[PDB]
Symmetry: C5
Subunit: 114 residues, 5 copies
């Protein structure tokens, strides 16, 4: 598996606009909401769950990176795998998107798979 | 269990106004106090205690997050489960509320579960 | 045991003014010095030692929190247990106080046991 | 093995211009892009991958240090070992360079093996 | 053993001017260079190696503290134990000094053993 798999979706020139931390089924988790830096379009919501999905090993690193980018408000590319979370109220509140990557973005390109 | 279970209480548009760190019964713990950003209502107090309650696994992540939201002073939704801490002096000083989640807020919403 | 036990001692309206990190007997440790925000009184010194005393489990969290308040320079209440550390040169250099808690203080009250 | 082995390569007076965090084959990883402080030259890309390659033990420290240097934008020397990552799409997106060290380049020169 | 043993050396009113992070023999390490706040005398170079020396258990705490002091630029007392590291290229690049402690300094005295 890889962040950059073409079966994963990504969204460039985004800003992390919201951050949530909580717990589900004995596992800490977090979610982020991202929006286009220019405000156009629909927000992306994605979550990471410490002990769930093939992406569990990256939980700490993505949490830290989300916090960092959230603190700077800089443009990023967000990478997700769709249809991963399955608890219905959790998906309703957030989404089924698993967060699988974050890339810094310049004016012209983003530093990550495309 | 889940932060967003409807058996948990939550309070929107709060600012973390105080922070305490200590130890009880072999466990490091932290407590926070929050007040409505607009001045209304009653302060909320909640604590997380390492290795204690069903919420133990999120202690570290919640501590870090509390420290962050505290440092920025931004508006948040605080999620608690009531009547969890039972040590009477501790409860009297702080509360029985376990801290089970923290959500950033916008002008119209907070990014987390609600009823 | 609890930070708020009345057999512990606390001091309000203080600022963490100094910070030291080292090692003793295979254990990392840190110490802090606090002084009254208003310049009155006598400094408080306390240490925490990674694998020593009943307070060992809180070492990391106390260190992080000491660092936090030290960086903000805000008014705090420091909670100690007296006469814990016993290595004479160590005590001479710092004190026998074990650091057992830290509370933020507003102008008229502190958020912690009293 | 050592960061300073002459079989490794390094580049001085660089600035970390981009940062990416992801996961590949069960491992969180990060990549950085660096460019000359004065704008010349060709970018340098390097990655560190958790629990992969002989440089795995330093993953956390290198991640933290990359973040630090990325946040300040200060001049640095980046140390790599070439031809370590083999996953082809990953290499095409980033590079095969393992990140093996980071040095500040402040006053006299770069503070690290040369 | 202790940071404050009289068989250790220390240097007061030093500013951390350089920072390096890398790996040697499967072990992360960092090194710092410090100079007198008034720019007199000779720089001090000291390293900490995870998994090596008796000071190994304090590695993370020292790295963290070095980073902090390095970012503030404040004057500190550096505690070292001499003649510890043995790999000649390493010693030649850096020094044989093991970092054993870091103390904040007021205008008149440092908060550490002397
Ligand atoms: C180990 C111990 O004895 N801890 C005490 C601690 C200690 O006496 C001093 O902090 C050491 O300097 O004091 C604690 O209570 C203080 C007393 O100073 C607070 O009530 C604090 O008091 C202030 O006004 C005081 C008077 O109350 C006192 O009688 O006289 C002094 C002058 O010598 C002051 O005028 C003060 O110190 O400014 C008012 C201030 O608002 C009070 N702080 C708070 C948070 O309410 C303490 O440090 O909390 C009690 C502790 O058990
Ligand atoms: C993998 C590899 O080749 N690593 C080299 C590295 C590399 O060639 C370049 O960094 C790629 O851009 O270069 C290293 O050595 C550099 C040379 O650039 C230092 O000597 C650096 O050189 C400066 O002046 C140089 C000349 O010395 C050189 O011959 O030609 C260039 C022309 O562009 C410059 O005029 C410079 O680049 O500014 C002087 C500067 O002070 C030097 N920096 C330091 C820290 O000494 C390197 O990047 O360290 C060597 C490495 O092995």
């Amino acid at each position: 598996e890889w962040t950059g798999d073409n079966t994963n979706a990504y969204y460039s020139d985004e800003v992390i606009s919201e951050l949530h931390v909580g717990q589900i089924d004995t596992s800490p988790y977090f979610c982020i909401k991202t929006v286009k830096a220019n405000g156009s379009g629909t927000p992306v919501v994605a979550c990471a769950v410490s002990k769930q999905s093939i992406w569990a090993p990256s939980f700490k690193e993505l949490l830290d990176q989300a916090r960092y980018f959230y603190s700077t408000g800089q443009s990023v590319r967000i990478h997700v795998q769709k249809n991963i979370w399955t608890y219905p109220l959790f998906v309703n509140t957030f989404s089924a998107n698993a967060l699988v990557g974050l890339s810094s973005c310049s004016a012209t390109q983003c530093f990550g798979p495309k």
